[PDB]
Write a protein that holds these residues in place. Sequence first.
Motif, PDB file in Angstrom:
ATOM      1  N   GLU A 102       0.715  -1.167   0.097  1.00  6.72           N
ATOM      2  CA  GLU A 102       0.028  -0.097   0.050  1.00  6.72           C
ATOM      3  C   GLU A 102       0.918   1.349   0.181  1.00  6.72           C
ATOM      4  O   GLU A 102       2.164   1.218   0.650  1.00  6.72           O
ATOM      5  N   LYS A 103       0.315   2.124  -0.699  1.00  5.96           N
ATOM      6  CA  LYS A 103       1.102   3.507  -1.237  1.00  5.96           C
ATOM      7  C   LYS A 103       0.335   4.646  -1.191  1.00  5.96           C
ATOM      8  O   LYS A 103      -0.833   4.776  -1.820  1.00  5.96           O
ATOM      9  N   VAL A 104       0.741   5.740  -0.116  1.00  5.08           N
ATOM     10  CA  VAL A 104      -0.258   6.724  -0.365  1.00  5.08           C
ATOM     11  C   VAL A 104       0.733   8.164  -0.104  1.00  5.08           C
ATOM     12  O   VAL A 104       1.669   8.324   0.808  1.00  5.08           O
ATOM     13  N   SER A 105       0.403   9.110  -1.103  1.00  3.43           N
ATOM     14  CA  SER A 105       1.018  10.436  -1.333  1.00  3.43           C
ATOM     15  C   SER A 105       0.144  11.601  -0.823  1.00  3.43           C
ATOM     16  O   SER A 105      -0.744  11.584  -1.446  1.00  3.43           O
ATOM     17  N   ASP A 106       0.729  12.482   0.014  1.00  8.01           N
ATOM     18  CA  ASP A 106      -0.140  13.597   0.694  1.00  8.01           C
ATOM     19  C   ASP A 106       0.733  14.714   0.447  1.00  8.01           C
ATOM     20  O   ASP A 106       1.571  14.948   0.752  1.00  8.01           O
ATOM     21  N   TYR A 107       0.199  15.645  -0.356  1.00 12.85           N
ATOM     22  CA  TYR A 107       0.720  16.940  -0.772  1.00 12.85           C
ATOM     23  C   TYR A 107       0.076  18.240  -0.141  1.00 12.85           C
ATOM     24  O   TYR A 107      -1.194  18.271  -0.210  1.00 12.85           O
ATOM     25  N   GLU A 108       0.700  18.933   0.904  1.00 13.59           N
ATOM     26  CA  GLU A 108      -0.225  20.372   1.206  1.00 13.59           C
ATOM     27  C   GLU A 108       0.493  21.455   0.422  1.00 13.59           C
ATOM     28  O   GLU A 108       1.568  21.756   0.422  1.00 13.59           O
ATOM     29  N   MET A 109      -0.470  21.959  -0.594  1.00 13.55           N
ATOM     30  CA  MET A 109       0.011  23.078  -1.270  1.00 13.55           C
ATOM     31  C   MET A 109      -0.334  24.351  -0.480  1.00 13.55           C
ATOM     32  O   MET A 109      -1.532  24.466  -0.276  1.00 13.55           O
ATOM     33  N   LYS A 110       0.506  25.330  -0.539  1.00 12.09           N
ATOM     34  CA  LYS A 110       0.398  26.772  -0.166  1.00 12.09           C
ATOM     35  C   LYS A 110      -0.581  27.527  -0.925  1.00 12.09           C
ATOM     36  O   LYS A 110      -0.275  27.338  -2.258  1.00 12.09           O
ATOM     37  N   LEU A 111      -1.652  28.135  -0.345  1.00  9.62           N
ATOM     38  CA  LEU A 111      -2.318  29.247  -1.276  1.00  9.62           C
ATOM     39  C   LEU A 111      -1.943  30.488  -1.151  1.00  9.62           C
ATOM     40  O   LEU A 111      -1.329  31.233  -0.422  1.00  9.62           O
ATOM     41  N   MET A 112      -2.563  31.321  -2.236  1.00 14.05           N
ATOM     42  CA  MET A 112      -2.231  32.847  -2.334  1.00 14.05           C
ATOM     43  C   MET A 112      -3.460  33.642  -2.038  1.00 14.05           C
ATOM     44  O   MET A 112      -4.598  33.261  -1.975  1.00 14.05           O
ATOM     45  N   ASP A 113      -3.304  35.176  -1.797  1.00 15.49           N
ATOM     46  CA  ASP A 113      -4.416  36.030  -1.666  1.00 15.49           C
ATOM     47  C   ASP A 113      -5.164  36.362  -2.705  1.00 15.49           C
ATOM     48  O   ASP A 113      -4.534  36.931  -3.855  1.00 15.49           O
TER      49      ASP A 113
END
Lengths: 243, 7
Positions: A102-113
């Motif tokens: 089993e394989k899981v990739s989590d990405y947290e992308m920063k947002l802009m104004d």
Amino acid sequence: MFEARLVQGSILKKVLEALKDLINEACWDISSSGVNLQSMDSSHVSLVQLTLRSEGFDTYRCDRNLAMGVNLTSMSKILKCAIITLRAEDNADTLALVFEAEKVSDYEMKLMDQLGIPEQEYSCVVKMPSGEFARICRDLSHIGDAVVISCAKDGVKFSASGELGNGNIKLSQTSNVDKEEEAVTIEMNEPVQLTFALRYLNFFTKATPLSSTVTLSMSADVPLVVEYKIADMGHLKYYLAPK
Amino acid sequence: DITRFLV
């Protein structure tokens, strides 16, 4: 809060590739209905309009409307690392992308104004294979900066001119058609002849992998509309102001 | 200019 699952992750990859070259940063407008993106390029010559309906996703939740300022290159890069889950909490400055296939990739992308095109009918509408249209724009951009598009009931012509010389491409209204998608169909109320910057059309033809078909809508003295269907999900429209 | 077409 927003949470959506798209089993066909490839669509989102293609949508981003079609956009990131024209638009650096955009506000994704998310609602109960689906996803909306409207934005002009930095040079204000053109405007793109994306729609992805909620029914196009496997699961979809949006409690109430929310807008996310997204760096499209960053999202492209993240999407380059890909079953997709998108998730944004209330009052958050990050969008979460969770991939699979089993394989899981989590990405947290920063947002802009605010500014929207009215809905109108068009003098002359052309449906043609998207590859044919991409090829035409690519070819002619090796002759000049601008294309003159002439739209009549029997055919559409594309013409450029520059240092080396000039070129004219004529496509006839198709007649004994084998497949729907290989047809060149023209619906003409008035003929129209207008000039457009080829640099921008070559930005638009990056949406070719989304759809075997492209639609060209023109009226005198108003912007060109280049439309790609997003199979079972929505559409991508580019608007290009005439010269 | 496209701005002059946008409402």
